[PDB]
Amino acid sequence: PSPNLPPGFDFTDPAIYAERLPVAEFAELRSAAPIWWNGQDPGKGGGFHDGGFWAITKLNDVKEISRHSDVFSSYENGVIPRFKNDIAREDIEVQRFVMLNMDAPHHTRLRKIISRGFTPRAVGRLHDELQERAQKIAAEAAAAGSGDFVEQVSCELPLQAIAGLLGVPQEDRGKLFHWSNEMTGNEDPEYAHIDPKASSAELIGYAMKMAEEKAKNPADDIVTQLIQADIDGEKLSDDEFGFFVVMLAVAGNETTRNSITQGMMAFAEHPDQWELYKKVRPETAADEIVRWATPVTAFQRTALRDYELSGVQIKKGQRVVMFYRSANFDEEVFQDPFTFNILRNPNPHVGFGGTGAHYCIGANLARMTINLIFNAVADHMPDLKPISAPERLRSGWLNGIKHWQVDYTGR
Template identity: 60%
Template sequence: MPAPAIPAGFDFTDPSLWETRNPTTEFAELRRTAPVWWNAQTDEQSGGFRDGGYWVVSRHEDIKEISRKPEIFSSQRKGSIIRLPGEITADQIELTSALLVNMDPPKHTKIRRIISKGFSPRAVEGLRAALADRAAAIVRGARESGGGDFVEQVACELPLQAIAELLGVPQEDRRKVFDWSNQMLNYDDPEYGDAVTTTSAANASMEILGYAWNLAEQRRADKLDDIVSQLVHADVDGESLASDEFGFFVILLAVAGNETTRNAITHGMKAFVDNPEQWELYKAERPRTAPDEIVRWATPVTAFQRTAVEDTVLGGQEIKAGQRVGLFYSSANFDEDAFEDPFRFDITRDPNPHLGFGGTGVHYCVGANLARLEIDLMFNAIADAMPDLTQVAEPERLRSGWINGIKHWRVRYA
């Protein structure tokens, strides 16, 4: 294969890059010439790792292979987040292993088995009626305002209310979760944090942990018919979450249940505005394939990482033990070998083997069905109540090295 035409010093996790655009041209170049490519980094560029760089894995097939082999590609060694605040230490990275996304089997298997109780098809379907009512109310409120910031008025609200509904958190506390998750994850954006220090992210994490700890202790003392009680009380197999484990589960929800779903909704609505024929089709037919195409198109998490625990070979490239590999879902979801006409937004796409829920394997998103439900309910509500939504200004993108986020988007609802 010819050498890729990637400029010297280019970094696929550079927050300033993602603040302006998706590097679709560069990803296509890698898929064609170097599907497993070493992205060298200075200590300053590496965002906390200071290990020389990482491998960019750009093809759908290779990312699926990595996802199926946790015994070779570890989530725990250096965590799953490919860019962290600049001053973070190795000991602080090690502490993040309490998060499910940063665990390896067998511990991951045990914790996931407990958490999955809250996301069974029956449990998710049990939320449908309440969330449908909330989606309709959110859209009615936005429509009455005439126009505004779609992210804050529409996209963020249902994921936040779903978390509150799932955990029995008072609805008035949902804004705390919104603010905490922004500070915890969006440290590269000066609107929310400081990429050089870990202070804002660490403080937000401690706030969520403390809040969740208290909630778990309340349910441990006074069991109710809700998911929190199920998770903190041992079942017939003797498995339950300790209060600190429950706290890290709530942090995971703040990430996977809030940030990612709200960004999928925003990117999805933007795609409909840019592809009005698809919006007309959606309003007429409401295809059940739409949520997965929205997630593929949005790819809210641009990349997670794994660390090789032994020397191995991937895509013909030798990878040394201890080296990081970046699973760039934002490239894989537009891989020409996996999707027909991948740059066409097609809400009837079927099959749709996207990796927007983290690929295959043990780390496939435990809340994928809840995310699909929220997206389906929200777009049905928008199509019913404000079908003529229009854009006032281009979206303001998040400055982040691993989240494909939109911070603000001015629209008119009627």
């Protein structure tokens, strides 16, 4: 029995996400066709011209694909499943220069090096400065009385996290943030004029300039650690560092921002959870917010060989799209998945991907950013109330909130 979906429904259609999350449609697949071929008409494949893809809606399938990276490749078609329909193939393949879109062994080398900058020590050293900034952000927003939660609360701290990790001087953080905000959102009319390719070129240039500067004058931030050769001569070239910085902007900015915005949307919809958060401040909240927000709706892989997955035959060369937004509400894994429960524990969500070679290296940095900012929101604007509905981002793989008017005070 075919799933009850509209003829031609495409789960990567940006026009859906500009309006809503296709929650009921995902649940229909989980029940009636947990692995479902998503057909795509000619020229409507968001940059991919292969007829469609396998929709992966169950968490254990998402995990199986993510563990078997030897079969399911990130390099072959990249992991973003939707661009503008007219994007040139070469602009897809230039994205192979970031570690996210690499397969082993190239990925293994880069991840090993880049792991130097995401040790628990490197991340935890940012705690106090980020905590201060979180408090300052929330204080300034509340003093404005009312405004755009996305811009006055959610946007800044993720960017300051990246700047702090990289040791970006304060004078430069303005243009770093600008470049990072021009990397995604390309398909929304409000951002139709951003040029992601131009922005990345400038970022790489700035990043390479910082790499050579930091070689001359080592410090104790991670840039020095990344570009200094270890015993085996391993280190990031200047351009490899540039592509690393580009990836941090792509992977660590709007995702965390959107977790914060939608975390607060969840709290506004579930005031008992909000009261419980304000009293207890449970850090488990961070994972339930990420599960609820699932900022990355989906990443894809490409089969390098035939592979049978939960009784479905994936063919060599076919794309499989991991719908984290569906898997994070999988009734077979989660107790009451549609209950927002900041105490959920354990919380095996795949908001940071499925466990495997590409698992989000910034997951704990993100969790700390979320906990710090929501502590500050609780400290400075505990009676925050929305004014109007959120505006969603037109994107086929990012679950974004562009704007959200809130009254930071009671009235």
